[PDB]
Amino acid sequence: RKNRAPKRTVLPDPVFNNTLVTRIINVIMEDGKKGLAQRILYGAFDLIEQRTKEKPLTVFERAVGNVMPRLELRVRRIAGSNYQVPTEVPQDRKIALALRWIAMFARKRHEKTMLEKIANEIIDASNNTGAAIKKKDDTHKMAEANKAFAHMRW
Amino acid sequence: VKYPELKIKLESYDSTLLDLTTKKIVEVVKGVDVKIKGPLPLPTKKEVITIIRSPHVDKASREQFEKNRHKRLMILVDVNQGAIDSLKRIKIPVGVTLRFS
Amino acid sequence: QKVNSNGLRFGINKNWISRWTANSHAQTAKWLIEDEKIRNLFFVNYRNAQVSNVEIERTQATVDVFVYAAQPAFLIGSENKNIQKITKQIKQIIGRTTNLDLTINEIGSPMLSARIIARDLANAIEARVPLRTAMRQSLIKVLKAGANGIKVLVSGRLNGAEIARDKMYIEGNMPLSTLRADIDYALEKAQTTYGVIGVKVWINRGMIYTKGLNR
Amino acid sequence: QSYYGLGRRKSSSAKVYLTPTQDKGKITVNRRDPSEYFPNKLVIQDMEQPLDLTDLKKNFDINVVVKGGGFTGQAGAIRLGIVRALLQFNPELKKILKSKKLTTRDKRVKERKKFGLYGARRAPQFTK
Amino acid sequence: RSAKKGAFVDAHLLKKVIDMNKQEKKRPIKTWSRRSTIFPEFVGNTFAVHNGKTFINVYVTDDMVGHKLGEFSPTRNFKQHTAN
Amino acid sequence: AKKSLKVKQTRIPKFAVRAYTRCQRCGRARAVLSHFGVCRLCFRELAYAGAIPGVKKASW
RNA sequence: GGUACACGAAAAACCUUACCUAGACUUGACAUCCUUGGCAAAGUUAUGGAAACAUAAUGCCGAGUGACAGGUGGUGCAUGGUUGUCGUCAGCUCGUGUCGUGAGAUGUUGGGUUAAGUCCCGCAACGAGCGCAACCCUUAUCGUUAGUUACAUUGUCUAGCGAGACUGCUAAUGCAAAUUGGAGGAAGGAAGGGAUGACGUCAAAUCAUCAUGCCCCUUAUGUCUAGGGCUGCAAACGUGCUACAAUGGCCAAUACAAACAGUCGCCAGCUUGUAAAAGUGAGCAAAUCUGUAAAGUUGGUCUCAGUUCGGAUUGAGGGCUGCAAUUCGUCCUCAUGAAGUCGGAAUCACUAGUAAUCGCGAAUCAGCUAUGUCGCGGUGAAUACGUUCUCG
Ligand SMILES: [Zn+2]
C-alpha cells in the first residue's frame, strides 16, 4: 500500500485566464512540446472566433459542463464473472476525465487537419452530440442500473 | 630580468597536495618577487571509466572509478633572475607535474 | 559480494601506494606493469622479511622504493650482501639508466598491519598447523597489541573436502559501514598441499577523526 | 540607479540590471527583443507575472544578459534574477513574492544517467 | 573498390600466370589467393582455387570482366534440413 | 594455447594491422584499456590495490 | 526461470581464434638450472614458396644437457578470488544470567514511533557485535582567495575555503521517542542523487582473467603459417531500430546547450567535387584552436492516399580505411520501392525534470547498419481516490 499522495500545482494561463485551459494544453501535448500544442489550441481558438462567433471561454465552459460525467465505475469482484460497482468521484477527476475524453475523441475523426477536427470536437461538446456526450451518457446509463451494488459496497 | 612572463602551470591528480604546493610557491615568491596575481582555478579535467564487476557475464552490476585531475595556473610578471635562483630549490612532489611558458 | 573495504576508503582516507606520472598513456602502462613486478617480488621471494607494503615514486627516469618491513636485516643481509643482490634484481627488472636509491625502514608496531598477520596465517596453515588454534594464537597476539576489533575468516580445504565448512572470527568494533574508520585489509593465498587457502584479515586501528584528507 | 540580481535555473546563468526609466520598462534582453528570441508563448509571459502582483511594468527597465541552458532554463533564471532585483529594490516584497512561491530556486534539473537504467529510471524490460 | 589502380591482385600471382600464358598455357595450376581480381589478360586458364577443404577448378572466360577470383568458389553448403 | 599467445603478441608483426592490444600481465585480448594497457578486471584488482596514481569511487 | 539471451565479447576480412582443412616444427614459440663462451641480436634485399620457412648476403647474444616448458584439455558436484538474486530487504547473532531433565526459550517479546532491531516507556533479563543510521562525494543558497585562454551593456564564471538546515524557535499531544502546524528561510522535519549491499540461500555463475589439487597429452590435445568459420538456414523466441503520416513529408532563412575528447590526432579556413570525400593548409598538448547541436520559430509547397508516408530488396557508378572488402566493412550518388493505415491471447516501464522525446560526447578500434553500451545537456507530462483483489 501507501499513504495519501500530494498533488503538484498547475498554474493558470494569464492570457485567457483559466487553469482548465492549461490542463487542455497539457493533455493535448505530445512528445513534451508546449509550443506545437499551444499553436494548435490557439488556432482552434481563432477558429472559434471565426465561425460561430462567440466567446471562446463561454463555449469552453459549456463544453466542460456538458461533457463532465456525473458518476464513475469501480471494479470490486468476488469470483468469476466479475461485477462492477458505481461510486462517487470528486469534481477534479471529473473534469480531468472530461478533458481526456475531449482529447482522445478529437484525434478520432474525419477532417484530417487537427485544427478543424479539434474545433469541431469542442463545438460538438458544447452542442451535446454523439462525439463525446454519447460516451458520458453510456457510462451514466450503466450506472444507476446496478445501483443496488452501489448502495451496499465498500 | 631578461625573462618576463614566467607562466608556470601546475597540474595534478590531487587537490590538497596541489593546494599545498601552490601555497608554498606563493609564500616563497612573496619575497623578492612582486606583482604576482593569485592562484588561478581551472576546470579540473575529469573522466570516468566503467568496468563490469564479475569475471563472467553479470552485466547488470558494473561499477566505475574516476581519475580526477585538478588544475591551477600561475603567471610571473618578471623573472628577477635572483628569484629563479631561489626557485631552483623548490623540489615539488611527483604528484604535481609542472609546465612553464 | 560486498565491496573490498580497502577500495571504498582508498583515495579519500588513504594515500595512494604508487604516486607517479608520465607521458599520457604512452608508457604509464609500462611503469605500472613494471613496479607491480617489484611489489610482487618483495611480497613473494622474501617471506622472511614480512614486508608490509612498498611505495613507488617515479618522475621522468627516477625511482625511489620506500619499504616498511618488520625485520630490515634480512633485506639488508649479512655485511650488506643481500641489499646489493635485491637492488640488482630491481635494476634488471627496471632497466639501467634509472637511479634506484632504495631505502628500508622498520615499521613501528608491525603487528597492527594486516599484511604481516595474514602472511603469518598463511605460513602456519601451509605448515599443517591446526587452523583453529593458529587463528586463536594470532588473534590474541594481535588484540593484545592494543588495537580494536578484528575479523579473520578462512575458506578453502580445511584439511579435507566439503569446503563449505568455513570458519569466521569477529572480536569487536570494526565498522565497515563507517568511512571515517581507519580500517586495514589484506589477503594471502596459503598454498596448502590440498589446494588454495585464502586468508583475509580486517584490522581496526582506532578512530581517524579530524583527518580532513589522506595523510 | 542600477539594480542587480542573478539566476541559475537548469545550467543557465542570468545577470540582470534594472533601472526605473521613463517608459513602461522597454524590455531588452541580450540587446534584442524577447518576442523573436523566445517564441511567443506563456514563457514570455512568465517574466512579468512577478510584476503583475506589483507595479506591473510601471517604470522598471529591463537590462538582462543570458547564458547557458536552453530557453526555459533561461526564462527561470531571468525570472529569479528579476524577483531578486525587486527584493533588492524594496524589502517590502518578500511577503508577496514568497507567498506565491516565485523565488526559492526550484532546482529541478536533469539527474545523472544511472547505469542499468536507460534514462536513469527506465529498466530495459522484463521477461520470464 | 580501390579507386586507384582498382584492379587488385596479391602481386605474387602475376608472375606464374604470365609465365604459363607464354609457356604453352598449361591449365592446372594451384592457387590459394581468393584475394585477387582478374586482369583482362587472365582469361584463358583454369585454377584450383582453395575454399577451405580442397581444390575446386574454375575456368575463366572473357564473358565477365572485373569480378573477384574467389567469388567463383562457394565456401558454405546449403540447408540440408532434417525433418524435425 | 595461452603462453604462445603471450610470446606472439610481443614479437614485431609482419604488418601494421597484424598486431593488437593486450594486457601485459595476462593474455586476455578483450576489454583491455589502451590508457592503462591493463585488463578491465586486472584494472579493477590493481585499483583496489591502488597501484594506479589516480583512482577514486565515482560520485558523479 | 526470475538471477540467459545488444550476455562473456569496451568491436573476428588476415591476426584476434580457442575450431576445421592443409602446409610445415619438435628441451620445442616461451622459462630456469648444469657445462661452455663472448658478438651479434633483430630487421633488409635477391632466391623457391601462399606463408611458416631452408637458403646467400647486411646489420645482451650464443652452443651441447634433464628436470621438462606448454595445454582456451577435464573436473565451479575439490576450489581461492570475483560476481548475481533475495536486497539497501531489517533483519542475523553473541557474552553473562534465568527458566526447562532436553532440543530450546527468555535479549529479538508488549505500546506507541519511523524507511529501518530508529528511538524511547513496560518487561528475568543486563549488555554487546554485524547491519541500518551518520562520517564521503555530488547538485541546490550566501560569504571569502584568485583572476586567464574566461567574462567584460562585468563581476559572471570556474575551483579552494567557510557559512547555511541543526525539529533551531513557536503551537498543539505525549512520560518519551516522536507526530503534525506555523514563522523565518534557498532548502524543515532521512533536501535530490550517487558511493556504500549483514548472517546466509540458490552444491547459483565463472577451472576460458588469474591462481589452483587431482587426471590426461607430449616428434602432440604443444609451436608457427595460408584458406575458411565463428555472419549459414525449413523454422521459433528474446532485446532493439524505423515506421505504418498531416502533431506529419519536403524546401529556404533561423537562434538556443552541457559535458567530453583531441599534435602519427582534432581539424580551422580555402579550392575541386550532384557526394562519399580529395587536395591545400593554419591554429591547437588545449577554458585560447578544433570536434557545424537537434528539437524549436518564420515562410512556402504538399492535401489523406500503400500515397509527394514508408524504406526494405535489388542493379550500377563513385569514396574511405586497410597489403587486401566474394563468405567477410562501411559511406555517398543514381535506379525500384516489399510490408505496414496502430496490431490476438497477453504483457512491460514510470510518482518530475521522471516518462516520452530532441539531439550531443566517450570507450574498445585503422574500418565497422553499435540501431549496442557507457555519459552530457534541450524540450518536456498525467495520476496516486484508495487497498477489495493480484505480485512478492
Ligand atoms: Zn590482464
Side-chain angles (χ1 to χ4, degrees), chain E residues 6-27:
Chain E
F8 178 85
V9 175
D10 67 351
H12 180 280
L13 206 50
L14 282 72
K15 64 162 261 183
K16 304 143 281 173
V17 298
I18 298 298
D19 271 354
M20 295 298 102
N21 203 335
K22 279 127 186 181
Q23 273 299 347
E24 192 273 332
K25 211 188 82 164
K26 304 308 299 164
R27 326 302 181 283

PDB file of all heavy atoms in Angstrom, chain E residues 4-27, unseen atoms left out:
ATOM      1  N   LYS E   4      42.131   3.557 -57.086  1.00  0.00           N
ATOM      2  CA  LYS E   4      43.460   3.918 -57.568  1.00  0.00           C
ATOM      3  C   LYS E   4      44.164   2.615 -57.909  1.00  0.00           C
ATOM      4  O   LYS E   4      44.558   1.874 -57.002  1.00  0.00           O
ATOM      5  CB  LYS E   4      44.238   4.718 -56.524  1.00  0.00           C
ATOM      6  N   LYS E   5      44.327   2.344 -59.204  1.00  0.00           N
ATOM      7  CA  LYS E   5      44.667   1.011 -59.687  1.00  0.00           C
ATOM      8  C   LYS E   5      43.691  -0.006 -59.094  1.00  0.00           C
ATOM      9  O   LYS E   5      44.051  -0.886 -58.310  1.00  0.00           O
ATOM     10  CB  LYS E   5      46.122   0.653 -59.365  1.00  0.00           C
ATOM     11  N   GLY E   6      42.423   0.156 -59.481  1.00  0.00           N
ATOM     12  CA  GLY E   6      41.355  -0.599 -58.844  1.00  0.00           C
ATOM     13  C   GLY E   6      41.513  -2.099 -58.991  1.00  0.00           C
ATOM     14  O   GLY E   6      41.267  -2.854 -58.046  1.00  0.00           O
ATOM     15  N   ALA E   7      41.921  -2.553 -60.175  1.00  0.00           N
ATOM     16  CA  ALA E   7      42.177  -3.974 -60.368  1.00  0.00           C
ATOM     17  C   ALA E   7      43.327  -4.405 -59.467  1.00  0.00           C
ATOM     18  O   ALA E   7      44.480  -4.034 -59.704  1.00  0.00           O
ATOM     19  CB  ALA E   7      42.485  -4.271 -61.838  1.00  0.00           C
ATOM     20  N   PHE E   8      43.024  -5.197 -58.439  1.00  0.00           N
ATOM     21  CA  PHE E   8      43.978  -5.527 -57.391  1.00  0.00           C
ATOM     22  C   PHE E   8      44.262  -7.022 -57.387  1.00  0.00           C
ATOM     23  O   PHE E   8      43.347  -7.840 -57.518  1.00  0.00           O
ATOM     24  CB  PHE E   8      43.463  -5.098 -56.012  1.00  0.00           C
ATOM     25  CG  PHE E   8      44.388  -5.457 -54.876  1.00  0.00           C
ATOM     26  CD1 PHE E   8      45.429  -4.616 -54.531  1.00  0.00           C
ATOM     27  CD2 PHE E   8      44.219  -6.637 -54.164  1.00  0.00           C
ATOM     28  CE1 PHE E   8      46.281  -4.936 -53.499  1.00  0.00           C
ATOM     29  CE2 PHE E   8      45.072  -6.958 -53.128  1.00  0.00           C
ATOM     30  CZ  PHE E   8      46.103  -6.109 -52.798  1.00  0.00           C
ATOM     31  N   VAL E   9      45.546  -7.368 -57.251  1.00  0.00           N
ATOM     32  CA  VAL E   9      45.990  -8.751 -57.126  1.00  0.00           C
ATOM     33  C   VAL E   9      47.042  -8.762 -56.022  1.00  0.00           C
ATOM     34  O   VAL E   9      47.657  -7.739 -55.710  1.00  0.00           O
ATOM     35  CB  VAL E   9      46.565  -9.313 -58.464  1.00  0.00           C
ATOM     36  CG1 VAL E   9      47.137 -10.719 -58.311  1.00  0.00           C
ATOM     37  CG2 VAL E   9      45.534  -9.277 -59.577  1.00  0.00           C
ATOM     38  N   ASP E  10      47.248  -9.940 -55.421  1.00  0.00           N
ATOM     39  CA  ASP E  10      48.268 -10.078 -54.387  1.00  0.00           C
ATOM     40  C   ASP E  10      49.662  -9.721 -54.892  1.00  0.00           C
ATOM     41  O   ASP E  10      50.593  -9.628 -54.085  1.00  0.00           O
ATOM     42  CB  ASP E  10      48.251 -11.500 -53.810  1.00  0.00           C
ATOM     43  CG  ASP E  10      48.692 -12.557 -54.806  1.00  0.00           C
ATOM     44  OD1 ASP E  10      48.864 -12.244 -56.002  1.00  0.00           O
ATOM     45  OD2 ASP E  10      48.895 -13.712 -54.374  1.00  0.00           O
ATOM     46  N   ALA E  11      49.828  -9.549 -56.204  1.00  0.00           N
ATOM     47  CA  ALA E  11      51.049  -9.136 -56.896  1.00  0.00           C
ATOM     48  C   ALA E  11      52.121 -10.222 -56.915  1.00  0.00           C
ATOM     49  O   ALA E  11      53.175 -10.020 -57.533  1.00  0.00           O
ATOM     50  CB  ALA E  11      51.641  -7.839 -56.321  1.00  0.00           C
ATOM     51  N   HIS E  12      51.882 -11.373 -56.298  1.00  0.00           N
ATOM     52  CA  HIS E  12      52.761 -12.520 -56.475  1.00  0.00           C
ATOM     53  C   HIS E  12      52.221 -13.518 -57.489  1.00  0.00           C
ATOM     54  O   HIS E  12      53.004 -14.253 -58.098  1.00  0.00           O
ATOM     55  CB  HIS E  12      52.994 -13.221 -55.133  1.00  0.00           C
ATOM     56  CG  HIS E  12      53.894 -14.417 -55.214  1.00  0.00           C
ATOM     57  ND1 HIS E  12      53.453 -15.652 -55.636  1.00  0.00           N
ATOM     58  CD2 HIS E  12      55.202 -14.571 -54.903  1.00  0.00           C
ATOM     59  CE1 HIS E  12      54.456 -16.511 -55.600  1.00  0.00           C
ATOM     60  NE2 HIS E  12      55.528 -15.881 -55.155  1.00  0.00           N
ATOM     61  N   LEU E  13      50.903 -13.549 -57.690  1.00  0.00           N
ATOM     62  CA  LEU E  13      50.295 -14.475 -58.637  1.00  0.00           C
ATOM     63  C   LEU E  13      50.487 -14.054 -60.088  1.00  0.00           C
ATOM     64  O   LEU E  13      50.214 -14.856 -60.987  1.00  0.00           O
ATOM     65  CB  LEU E  13      48.800 -14.629 -58.344  1.00  0.00           C
ATOM     66  CG  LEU E  13      48.143 -15.945 -58.781  1.00  0.00           C
ATOM     67  CD1 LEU E  13      48.944 -17.133 -58.288  1.00  0.00           C
ATOM     68  CD2 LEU E  13      46.717 -16.033 -58.276  1.00  0.00           C
ATOM     69  N   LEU E  14      50.922 -12.819 -60.344  1.00  0.00           N
ATOM     70  CA  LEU E  14      51.089 -12.377 -61.727  1.00  0.00           C
ATOM     71  C   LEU E  14      52.174 -13.172 -62.440  1.00  0.00           C
ATOM     72  O   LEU E  14      51.998 -13.581 -63.592  1.00  0.00           O
ATOM     73  CB  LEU E  14      51.426 -10.888 -61.771  1.00  0.00           C
ATOM     74  CG  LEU E  14      50.341  -9.829 -61.575  1.00  0.00           C
ATOM     75  CD1 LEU E  14      49.856  -9.748 -60.153  1.00  0.00           C
ATOM     76  CD2 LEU E  14      50.856  -8.478 -62.068  1.00  0.00           C
ATOM     77  N   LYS E  15      53.299 -13.412 -61.768  1.00  0.00           N
ATOM     78  CA  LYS E  15      54.466 -13.947 -62.456  1.00  0.00           C
ATOM     79  C   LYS E  15      54.196 -15.338 -63.025  1.00  0.00           C
ATOM     80  O   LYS E  15      54.520 -15.610 -64.187  1.00  0.00           O
ATOM     81  CB  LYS E  15      55.670 -13.942 -61.515  1.00  0.00           C
ATOM     82  CG  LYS E  15      55.568 -14.835 -60.288  1.00  0.00           C
ATOM     83  CD  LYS E  15      56.948 -15.077 -59.691  1.00  0.00           C
ATOM     84  CE  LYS E  15      57.526 -16.415 -60.127  1.00  0.00           C
ATOM     85  NZ  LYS E  15      58.853 -16.686 -59.493  1.00  0.00           N
ATOM     86  N   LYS E  16      53.562 -16.221 -62.249  1.00  0.00           N
ATOM     87  CA  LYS E  16      53.339 -17.571 -62.756  1.00  0.00           C
ATOM     88  C   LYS E  16      52.249 -17.622 -63.821  1.00  0.00           C
ATOM     89  O   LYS E  16      52.377 -18.391 -64.779  1.00  0.00           O
ATOM     90  CB  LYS E  16      53.010 -18.540 -61.616  1.00  0.00           C
ATOM     91  CG  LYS E  16      54.052 -18.598 -60.506  1.00  0.00           C
ATOM     92  CD  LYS E  16      53.395 -18.753 -59.146  1.00  0.00           C
ATOM     93  CE  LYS E  16      52.845 -17.439 -58.629  1.00  0.00           C
ATOM     94  NZ  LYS E  16      52.058 -17.646 -57.381  1.00  0.00           N
ATOM     95  N   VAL E  17      51.185 -16.824 -63.695  1.00  0.00           N
ATOM     96  CA  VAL E  17      50.147 -16.851 -64.722  1.00  0.00           C
ATOM     97  C   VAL E  17      50.665 -16.252 -66.026  1.00  0.00           C
ATOM     98  O   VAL E  17      50.359 -16.749 -67.115  1.00  0.00           O
ATOM     99  CB  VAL E  17      48.861 -16.157 -64.232  1.00  0.00           C
ATOM    100  CG1 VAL E  17      48.302 -16.877 -63.021  1.00  0.00           C
ATOM    101  CG2 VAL E  17      49.106 -14.696 -63.910  1.00  0.00           C
ATOM    102  N   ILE E  18      51.465 -15.184 -65.943  1.00  0.00           N
ATOM    103  CA  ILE E  18      52.082 -14.619 -67.139  1.00  0.00           C
ATOM    104  C   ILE E  18      53.060 -15.614 -67.756  1.00  0.00           C
ATOM    105  O   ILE E  18      53.115 -15.764 -68.985  1.00  0.00           O
ATOM    106  CB  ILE E  18      52.763 -13.277 -66.811  1.00  0.00           C
ATOM    107  CG1 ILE E  18      51.728 -12.271 -66.315  1.00  0.00           C
ATOM    108  CG2 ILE E  18      53.485 -12.725 -68.029  1.00  0.00           C
ATOM    109  CD1 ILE E  18      50.663 -11.956 -67.333  1.00  0.00           C
ATOM    110  N   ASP E  19      53.848 -16.298 -66.925  1.00  0.00           N
ATOM    111  CA  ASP E  19      54.770 -17.304 -67.446  1.00  0.00           C
ATOM    112  C   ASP E  19      54.021 -18.406 -68.181  1.00  0.00           C
ATOM    113  O   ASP E  19      54.329 -18.712 -69.337  1.00  0.00           O
ATOM    114  CB  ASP E  19      55.610 -17.884 -66.307  1.00  0.00           C
ATOM    115  CG  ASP E  19      56.880 -17.098 -66.059  1.00  0.00           C
ATOM    116  OD1 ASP E  19      57.167 -16.172 -66.848  1.00  0.00           O
ATOM    117  OD2 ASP E  19      57.595 -17.411 -65.085  1.00  0.00           O
ATOM    118  N   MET E  20      53.011 -18.998 -67.533  1.00  0.00           N
ATOM    119  CA  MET E  20      52.272 -20.092 -68.160  1.00  0.00           C
ATOM    120  C   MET E  20      51.567 -19.631 -69.429  1.00  0.00           C
ATOM    121  O   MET E  20      51.589 -20.332 -70.445  1.00  0.00           O
ATOM    122  CB  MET E  20      51.264 -20.686 -67.175  1.00  0.00           C
ATOM    123  CG  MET E  20      51.886 -21.367 -65.964  1.00  0.00           C
ATOM    124  SD  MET E  20      52.932 -22.776 -66.387  1.00  0.00           S
ATOM    125  CE  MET E  20      54.563 -22.056 -66.214  1.00  0.00           C
ATOM    126  N   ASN E  21      50.949 -18.447 -69.392  1.00  0.00           N
ATOM    127  CA  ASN E  21      50.288 -17.907 -70.577  1.00  0.00           C
ATOM    128  C   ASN E  21      51.254 -17.755 -71.745  1.00  0.00           C
ATOM    129  O   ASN E  21      50.820 -17.789 -72.901  1.00  0.00           O
ATOM    130  CB  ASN E  21      49.644 -16.560 -70.236  1.00  0.00           C
ATOM    131  CG  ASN E  21      48.510 -16.191 -71.176  1.00  0.00           C
ATOM    132  OD1 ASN E  21      48.456 -16.638 -72.322  1.00  0.00           O
ATOM    133  ND2 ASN E  21      47.589 -15.366 -70.689  1.00  0.00           N
ATOM    134  N   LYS E  22      52.547 -17.600 -71.470  1.00  0.00           N
ATOM    135  CA  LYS E  22      53.575 -17.559 -72.501  1.00  0.00           C
ATOM    136  C   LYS E  22      54.406 -18.839 -72.523  1.00  0.00           C
ATOM    137  O   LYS E  22      55.507 -18.851 -73.085  1.00  0.00           O
ATOM    138  CB  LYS E  22      54.476 -16.339 -72.297  1.00  0.00           C
ATOM    139  CG  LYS E  22      53.896 -15.048 -72.849  1.00  0.00           C
ATOM    140  CD  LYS E  22      53.894 -13.956 -71.791  1.00  0.00           C
ATOM    141  CE  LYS E  22      53.194 -12.701 -72.286  1.00  0.00           C
ATOM    142  NZ  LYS E  22      53.218 -11.620 -71.261  1.00  0.00           N
ATOM    143  N   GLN E  23      53.902 -19.914 -71.920  1.00  0.00           N
ATOM    144  CA  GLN E  23      54.611 -21.188 -71.834  1.00  0.00           C
ATOM    145  C   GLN E  23      53.667 -22.329 -72.205  1.00  0.00           C
ATOM    146  O   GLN E  23      53.544 -23.323 -71.490  1.00  0.00           O
ATOM    147  CB  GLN E  23      55.197 -21.408 -70.439  1.00  0.00           C
ATOM    148  CG  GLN E  23      56.591 -20.822 -70.222  1.00  0.00           C
ATOM    149  CD  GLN E  23      57.648 -21.402 -71.144  1.00  0.00           C
ATOM    150  OE1 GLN E  23      57.436 -22.420 -71.803  1.00  0.00           O
ATOM    151  NE2 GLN E  23      58.808 -20.756 -71.186  1.00  0.00           N
ATOM    152  N   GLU E  24      52.967 -22.169 -73.331  1.00  0.00           N
ATOM    153  CA  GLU E  24      52.032 -23.125 -73.927  1.00  0.00           C
ATOM    154  C   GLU E  24      50.699 -23.157 -73.174  1.00  0.00           C
ATOM    155  O   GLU E  24      49.779 -23.863 -73.598  1.00  0.00           O
ATOM    156  CB  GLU E  24      52.658 -24.532 -74.033  1.00  0.00           C
ATOM    157  CG  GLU E  24      51.936 -25.580 -74.887  1.00  0.00           C
ATOM    158  CD  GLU E  24      50.867 -26.347 -74.136  1.00  0.00           C
ATOM    159  OE1 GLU E  24      50.996 -26.491 -72.903  1.00  0.00           O
ATOM    160  OE2 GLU E  24      49.898 -26.801 -74.778  1.00  0.00           O
ATOM    161  N   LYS E  25      50.540 -22.354 -72.119  1.00  0.00           N
ATOM    162  CA  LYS E  25      49.257 -22.165 -71.435  1.00  0.00           C
ATOM    163  C   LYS E  25      48.742 -23.467 -70.811  1.00  0.00           C
ATOM    164  O   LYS E  25      47.717 -24.023 -71.212  1.00  0.00           O
ATOM    165  CB  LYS E  25      48.224 -21.558 -72.390  1.00  0.00           C
ATOM    166  CG  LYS E  25      47.196 -20.662 -71.723  1.00  0.00           C
ATOM    167  CD  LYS E  25      46.094 -20.268 -72.694  1.00  0.00           C
ATOM    168  CE  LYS E  25      45.039 -21.355 -72.805  1.00  0.00           C
ATOM    169  NZ  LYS E  25      43.785 -20.843 -73.422  1.00  0.00           N
ATOM    170  N   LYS E  26      49.489 -23.952 -69.818  1.00  0.00           N
ATOM    171  CA  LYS E  26      49.039 -25.082 -69.015  1.00  0.00           C
ATOM    172  C   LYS E  26      47.778 -24.719 -68.240  1.00  0.00           C
ATOM    173  O   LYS E  26      47.681 -23.629 -67.667  1.00  0.00           O
ATOM    174  CB  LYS E  26      50.137 -25.517 -68.042  1.00  0.00           C
ATOM    175  CG  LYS E  26      51.470 -25.871 -68.681  1.00  0.00           C
ATOM    176  CD  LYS E  26      51.308 -26.880 -69.806  1.00  0.00           C
ATOM    177  CE  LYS E  26      50.708 -28.187 -69.304  1.00  0.00           C
ATOM    178  NZ  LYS E  26      50.206 -29.028 -70.427  1.00  0.00           N
ATOM    179  N   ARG E  27      46.802 -25.640 -68.226  1.00  0.00           N
ATOM    180  CA  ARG E  27      45.566 -25.375 -67.488  1.00  0.00           C
ATOM    181  C   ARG E  27      45.740 -25.521 -65.981  1.00  0.00           C
ATOM    182  O   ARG E  27      45.527 -24.536 -65.254  1.00  0.00           O
ATOM    183  CB  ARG E  27      44.433 -26.256 -68.025  1.00  0.00           C
ATOM    184  CG  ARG E  27      44.481 -26.559 -69.518  1.00  0.00           C
ATOM    185  CD  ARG E  27      44.471 -25.284 -70.354  1.00  0.00           C
ATOM    186  NE  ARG E  27      44.482 -25.561 -71.787  1.00  0.00           N
ATOM    187  CZ  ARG E  27      45.559 -25.928 -72.473  1.00  0.00           C
ATOM    188  NH1 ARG E  27      46.728 -26.063 -71.861  1.00  0.00           N
ATOM    189  NH2 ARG E  27      45.470 -26.158 -73.777  1.00  0.00           N
TER     190      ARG E  27
END
